[PDB]
Symmetry: D2
């Protein structure tokens, strides 16, 4: 009994329907493979690379308490290093968890069918979704189009796979020679040397590792799930889940956040505390958006499999740099649009709606190439998914700054935290200081120019 477990994005030792199977047959030794030779343009971002650089030491320490080791390996020809350890340990099946980005379904399918050459087979599993992306059908076996009708379907199926248990103890493979070309994390070029501390001060407002995701989940529900309904439009403060980074990397089983959040939604329904019950629907509706991402990405091919889906690939964005240089620096001249970008670079996370503020501003007002923008988004955000992000820059494809600010920001407290220079305007007309009278600004300490960035462009022509 010898089996290899290949790890991609399931760095958790609780509710893994790939790992959990392996503990039955016999001993194992896991494997992480990093091959930057095949990703083409889909190479990871700048801090997302940082993320994997951190949880690994957290995870690999975990097997040292369950009696084994995660054994990292770099290479170009993943098949060969697979062919290597197949030669050095004599296991027969290589279990693993599915992936759904279309830079992976080509990688998996080819390596498996080239793995039968040695009479070597494989069983793939589902360890990151609620429903299969091939389960939901219409009446005639077609793909849905409206998520709302989609969510009703998944909401009344109630069929899951299993919430498996955690294994008791691993069966460890002894060792092997050093002809696999890598042993330690540093040789993996996840993070460059010139930016090692500079890309490390995000550790104040973050702490990866599934051990952390457990603390953050339990502390979340009992404390502030009752107020998620009356906070999801509040951009200020930690007013939402903050479980975006963990989910993309598979550190907390989303089919576990679906139970431990479900078993509270029933309690308030029993007590008829309809306030708390109403907050639970938007949350679970939240996760359901994520299914709409991948399910479409598999039923339809991603963005038509080309540059963009059907219409926005050759739109004449102004072929200019400094505005694009200005869009990210935080000097566009607007309170909102410049607000978060001073914070995006600060901790690599923004509210879910503010992103939809900043996003539409560039392509629809600055007229800059989204490829220059989305690439920056992939370049900077922690949890920069491949599938949902391209969904994000489709709903943003098809806004008076005054009105939407008050609803999003009622009392002018957000801008005062990420733009301290404007801490002396009245709560009225703060979000659009260029519209107020000239003399009231003199009443404050805001003078556009040398002490505050004038607006790059205005809506009068925009």
């Amino acid at each position: 009994k010898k089996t290899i477990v290949w790890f991609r994005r399931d760095l958790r030792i609780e509710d893994n329907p790939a790992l959990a199977a392996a503990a039955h047959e016999g001993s194992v030794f896991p494997v992480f493979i990093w091959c930057p030779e095949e990703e083409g343009q889909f190479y990871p971002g700048r801090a997302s690379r940082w993320w994997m650089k951190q949880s690994l030491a957290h995870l690999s320490q975990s097997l040292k308490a369950l009696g084994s080791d995660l054994t990292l390996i770099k290479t170009h020809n993943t098949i060969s290093a697979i062919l290597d350890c197949i030669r050095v340990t004599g296991a027969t099946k290589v279990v693993f968890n599915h992936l759904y980005d279309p830079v992976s379904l080509v990688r998996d399918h080819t390596v498996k069918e080239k793995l039968v050459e040695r009479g070597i087979s494989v069983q793939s599993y589902n360890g990151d979704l609620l429903y299969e992306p091939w389960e939901i059908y219409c009446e005639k076996g077609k793909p849905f189009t409206s998520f709302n009708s989609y969510w009703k379907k998944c909401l009344d199926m109630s069929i899951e796979s299993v919430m498996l248990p955690p294994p008791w103890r691993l069966m460890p493979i002894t060792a092997a020679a050093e002809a696999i070309w890598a042993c330690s994390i540093e040789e993996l070029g996840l993070e460059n040397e010139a930016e090692k501390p500079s890309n490390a001060l995000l550790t104040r407002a973050w702490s990866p590792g599934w051990s952390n995701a457990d603390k953050l989940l339990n502390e979340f529900i009992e404390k502030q799930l009752i107020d998620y309904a009356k906070n999801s439009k509040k951009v200020v403060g930690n007013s939402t889940s903050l479980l975006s980074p963990y989910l993309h990397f598979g550190e907390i089983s989303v089919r576990h956040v679906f139970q431990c959040a479900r078993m509270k939604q029933i309690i308030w329904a029993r007590d008829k505390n309809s306030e708390g019950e109403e907050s639970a629907d938007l949350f679970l509706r939240g996760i359901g958006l994520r299914e709409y991402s991948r399910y479409i990405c598999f039923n339809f091919p991603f963005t038509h499999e080309q540059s963009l889906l059907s219409h926005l690939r050759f739109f004449p964005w102004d072929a200019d740099v400094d505005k694009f240089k200005a869009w990210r620096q935080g000097r566009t001249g607007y309170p909102l649009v410049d607000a978060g970008m001073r914070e995006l670079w600060a901790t690599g996370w923004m509210h879910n709606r503010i992103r939809v503020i900043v996003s539409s501003f560039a392509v629809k007002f600055l007229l800059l190439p989204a490829k220059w923008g989305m690439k920056y988004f992939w370049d900077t955000l922690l949890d920069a998914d491949l599938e949902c992000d391209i969904l994000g820059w489709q709903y943003i494809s098809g806004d008076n700054p005054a009105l939407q600010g008050a609803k999003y920001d009622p009392e002018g407290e957000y801008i005062r935290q990420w733009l301290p220079e404007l801490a002396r305007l009245p709560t009225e007309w703060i979000h659009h200081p260029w519209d107020a009278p000239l003399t009231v600004l003199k009443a404050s300490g805001v003078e556009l120019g040398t002490n505050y960035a004038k607006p790059i462009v205005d809506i009068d022509t925009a």
Copy 2:
């Protein structure tokens, strides 16, 4: 397409494997049967009757939120009433859970028989035990007999069940005709109006219902599981888990107690938190006693002699009434056993230490018969589970020595016997022999505001 569940001691829906398994094949219809006289002498006790009357009503709301209603039949011909309720819907399935009491075992092999022979399908499930007591083997087909040997093997076979989720939208069928006599719990014979006002005062210390179980669990594991290894032996107040009733009635799925109490055990091991790693494995071994009862009842053969298997069937040695009239009134004299019985009579629960002190003195020194022993616990103890009771007495078949390891400061005796508010611990645990002056200066004159020790410990 149509099924009829049948709850016996699984008053819970989160992880009810005999429940979700019915939700997928169509529609369901819950039921609860009461066995008034087919229990013979195994009629549940007084207090234990009360806990059920508070658990069901709370539970009846819970399934109501899911869109269904629990029905309640009271008869001594279970196969008959179940055979009647079948013809109201024509279901081909009747699910339940596996139980190992000597009276429902025989009740179960027949009900399937009268159903399989009559030909209507039925599935059982397992939802009360991690390991089924037929799985564990020693070499080929023999059982173990040393619990440490048993537990040493359970820690090395992780193959077990899979905790399901709770369903979403349950659909009953019709509930058409009440000819099955859909009796109400108030119409169900659970208590007596004469004694009813007294028993309701138990709510000052407990609150039944499965939903309260969860709010206690997270209240437990996140707060005091880290130091349970240094609070199990301190009899005073609330130290232990206080889960014993909720696990007897299936108020909470035991396995989920074994997940959320393991993940908080692997974290400390990774962190070198050597203290917490000790207190974790003195709780998960705590549950381990629980299975070991079940594994002796079924796979070891039952009491071939009377209920007490092969130890005490000849030497009761007494038929007194006044002594038994004195042992349960807290007028014994020993200021440790007295502090218990008033604790039991006041809240219907004791700590595991005291449950082995009031017993040992109840037989080794008071000369009373064992049979009188078990039933009095059997009538009042909230968590009176029979399998975990014969184990309680076969473990047993001066207090100052044992007065130190369990309660050193003597804080306990000054909570339930306030007459001794002015005695130091050097004489609180045995007043009969203290110096004559110390009793005078304190508010204790033997016999007048406290009775002497009922039997001399020194000789007998």
Copy 3:
């Protein structure tokens, strides 16, 4: 220049105006004189004495942080005693505080007129009361007669006392070997020997020392004083302030608490929190009664000229000593009565509402001589003063079926002290002997075996 500060019942450093006045002239060194040969019948009780022994030792450490050393002395005659201190110190002035009990006014009256013969200036300083018992008169200069006729007159006073700070550094003065006839505490003997191991169990519910006082008052006012209206008549739990013993021994200054609430009340006086405003008023009146007590004990006849009003020794007494030893052991039957004495004997303190029940008991429903009723209270109350206490046995000189719901609605007070009634329904606990047998036997209470019978019929 050189002075001798005298400590009698004001063991505090903050706001001791007799001391701060001597914090300007020169060097000071404290003194505590003891003589158990001048009080005779006024010898403070058993639990009273332990308060001194557990407050002085707390005080002495506080004065040594400022460069001083409280000396302690025994003597048969204080006059000859203090003259010894002149023998070595050779100081010049003498400052003390005023008292009002009938034993001190005679002694201290001799002190002034017997030290001027030695050409020694001597002063007093009234730092224990709010208003002088002699300054308040009627319009015609006669005294008042009734409390409420007096309290309104005391809410508009002009010539107030003064608040003081604590000095920084005290210049001590070392004279010679300690003294004649005595030592620190050993020869004064605040406690006998064998009584010591028992008394220490009082520390669980009290902690002497003025340093603990300030922690309490700040903890009491800004946390509990808002609800004093709704807790003044609830017997269970720490309803009232729990300040009585400190304010007797002067461990806190009465003119500092009275300020700390008035400045507090005016805050609520602005926001229209009358319910918070009104509860503040009762505590204010609570100080009014106590001050009222010192009034009539000075300008009205000395203890009314007798323990019984002037003679009051002829009416029916029927001295049956059996009940007395029967009463104070808490075995009388009336569960509220025996509730008290099982708290009075375990923490040396009761709620004042309770103290008017039992006090009515020993004389009315039992006919015992009142002097037997003081000898117990004086012997075990931790705040057994002389002046307010005589008021207690004078304010009195009612059916429990009613007042039971008056002061303990749900009956929590009985079940905390008497646990054997833990299974009566609440509407019967306050009077069991009216119960029907179908509920006594149905509960665990058998009148006459474990819980004593009524000592006497209520219609007697």
Copy 4:
């Protein structure tokens, strides 16, 4: 019987010996006079002028509960109105509290010189100090030279006054000439009204709040004053400066409870606390040294400046100074100053000396030219204390920034741009070699103003 107490800078009813001194007698009538033209330059700034608005709104609502009333007289001339209200009410006493600033010193003496004509006696009471500087004459009348020399004699001679009780009853007793409302007594202008809105987030005036910050501070954080006082980060300071300035809390009562817990920790041998206490009462301490020099000599011995800073020429220009309140001085340790001081009206002491010392020693502006601006925006504008520190001044942005900002998170809280540099660089970005610059998000000149200075 009636007496006219005269509230000047003691807006509180607790421990006010200029008020309760009337209570022994009888009816009173409080009045508050303002004159925006007799103070000349000392016309209080925008910051302090706003603070006055809340307290009087808070005191008037306070005294009325005692069955009384407090008008709001305004005048062209102070001495005139008092004799005017005299005739209307016909009292015999006009008590008030002292103020030891020379601009108002002579004023009270001017009214002590006119009241003896009418034959109504006056009584001034000590309501701001533990030691009214007349008694502390040492060595027969030669004042001290340092502070600690001054702070020592008072200790061994620690005689004080008696903390007087609060009052119980205030039975009180036409147009007090051309009586004016609250808003005609202009403390604000029309424009600056809404901009004063956000300042409420930082403070909440009123004597009824001073006690809370007092009692909360004494029993919660006074242990950590010895270890937090040299930390710019967070709230590691009492923040009791304004509440103490306007007489909203009796300064001696603060010394009382402080000394109480001090000796308490001496009992339990908590040696760590006992240094936390003695350091703190030193904090109130040097305040007393301010008025001690301001009495025995007028401030700077005659005028606003001692005798010197008229030579030693300045960098006569405003575009330099125009940067300062704009907070573009390059050094984030300074530009973290103005961005706060502009937005809160308060700065920690240590930052205050590193910003104050800058304008004269590096920017080289006129010293008075910067002091005046502080009077406009610091919520604690006080001549007898502002001139103290400015006379206290007359280093390295990294060598000193290390003690008071170990992680720099104080800068990443007020300077949202620089949130991505290592802690050992964020005080002087120009030293960070270029490899750590473009990788980080800052390029000086566009993403952050270049330091307009030569560092040496």
